[PDB]
Amino acid sequence: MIKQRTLKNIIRATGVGLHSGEKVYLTLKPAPVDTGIVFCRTDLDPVVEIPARAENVGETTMSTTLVKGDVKVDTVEHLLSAMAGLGIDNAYVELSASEVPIMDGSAGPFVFLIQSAGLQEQEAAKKFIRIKREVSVEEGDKRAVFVPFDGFKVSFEIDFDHPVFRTQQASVDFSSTSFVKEVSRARTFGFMRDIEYLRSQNLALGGSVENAIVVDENRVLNEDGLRYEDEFVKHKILDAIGDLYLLGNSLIGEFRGFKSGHALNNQLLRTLIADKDAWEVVTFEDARTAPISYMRP
Ligand SMILES: CC#CCOc1ccc(C(=O)N[C@H](C(=O)NO)C(C)(C)N)cc1
Ligand SMILES: [Zn+2]
């Protein structure tokens, strides 16, 4: 069988929230079978747990935020993209603040911290969600779609009227290309002109060339340039993988994004969940037959 996975050992990371600018401690802890991903705010008294599920998504303005009453966990998408890429089903995510650390702006440091500690396969089948029919959400010129596909594929299109914006479309098939090599290192991006407005709203407070691609009026400000020729659209793919992982199970299908973001990604998940005839929970007794393959633990 394709087994569920958790962490072999507890791992720790320190960083700052991209939007809050606040120092934060992140701890990833091994979790038992069928736990899912659960956030734990250890700076609160009492401590608050927020399961990483589509129903707990409260805000989608700049990042995906989880909410439980008056308690929040901001910018969960890059850590969840790393967990989805590596096939982590169960984990406790302890945070000392309301925002996950931005690290270098990509999923790269999270992928490394997890792979350093290593993965533990658990004696229970991994549950997948197969897309049986097309599900789509549109709002204005923005669109987010699930199409049946025997594997996992992400297609994305962005349309920025800026001189820096190169390849604005990309399609990644996870049967042909690894998450680690092709997507994990794609950093988040911001426009210098927006950062001014964002900081007046207490947003992007921790943003810098150290954790983001910073775009000027005509070029990338970062001394060392880009990690990929199409790093902007590859980061949008990284975000969709993370937002989609809030479904709580790995998807077997194709995601297509057209100028979409966190808000529409969550709306698509909400529509899929509601449209129960569009999907089915499946397990694979033989990994040789399975449409999605994961790296050895
Ligand atoms: C100096 C300096 C600086 C950096 O400042 C910012 C400001 C905002 C963002 C942001 O909103 N990013 C989003 C993201 O990746 N959500 O996961 C994205 C790409 C979907 N809009 C990123 C960096
Ligand atoms: Zn992002």
UniProtKB/Swiss-Prot annotation:
One of its GO terms (molecular function) is UDP-3-O-acyl-N-acetylglucosamine deacetylase activity. Its cofactor is Zn(2+). The active site is at 262 (proton donor). Pathway: Glycolipid biosynthesis; lipid IV(A) biosynthesis; lipid IV(A) from (3R)-3-hydroxytetradecanoyl-[acyl-carrier-protein] and UDP-N-acetyl-alpha-D-glucosamine: step 2/6. It catalyses: a UDP-3-O-[(3R)-3-hydroxyacyl]-N-acetyl-alpha-D-glucosamine + H2O = a UDP-3-O-[(3R)-3-hydroxyacyl]-alpha-D-glucosamine + acetate. Keywords: Hydrolase, Lipid A biosynthesis, Lipid biosynthesis, Lipid metabolism, Metal-binding, Zinc. It is an enzyme of class 3 (hydrolase). Its EC number is 3.5.1.108. GO terms for cellular component: membrane. Zn(2+) binds at residues 78, 235, 239. It holds the Pfam family LpxC. GO terms for biological process: lipid A biosynthetic process. The keyword Zinc applies. InterPro entries: Ribosomal_Su5_D2-typ_SF, UDP-acyl_GlcNac_deAcase, UDP-acyl_GlcNac_deAcase_C, UDP-acyl_N-AcGlcN_deAcase_N. The keyword tRNA processing does not apply. Belongs to the LpxC family. HAMAP family: LpxC (MF_00388). NCBIfam families: lpxC. Catalyzes the hydrolysis of UDP-3-O-myristoyl-N-acetylglucosamine to form UDP-3-O-myristoylglucosamine and acetate, the committed step in lipid A biosynthesis. This is UDP-3-O-acyl-N-acetylglucosamine deacetylase. It comes from Pseudomonas aeruginosa (strain ATCC 15692 / DSM 22644 / CIP 104116 / JCM 14847 / LMG 12228 / 1C / PRS 101 / PAO1). The lineage of its organism: Bacteria, Pseudomonadati, Pseudomonadota, Gammaproteobacteria, Pseudomonadales. The gene is lpxC.
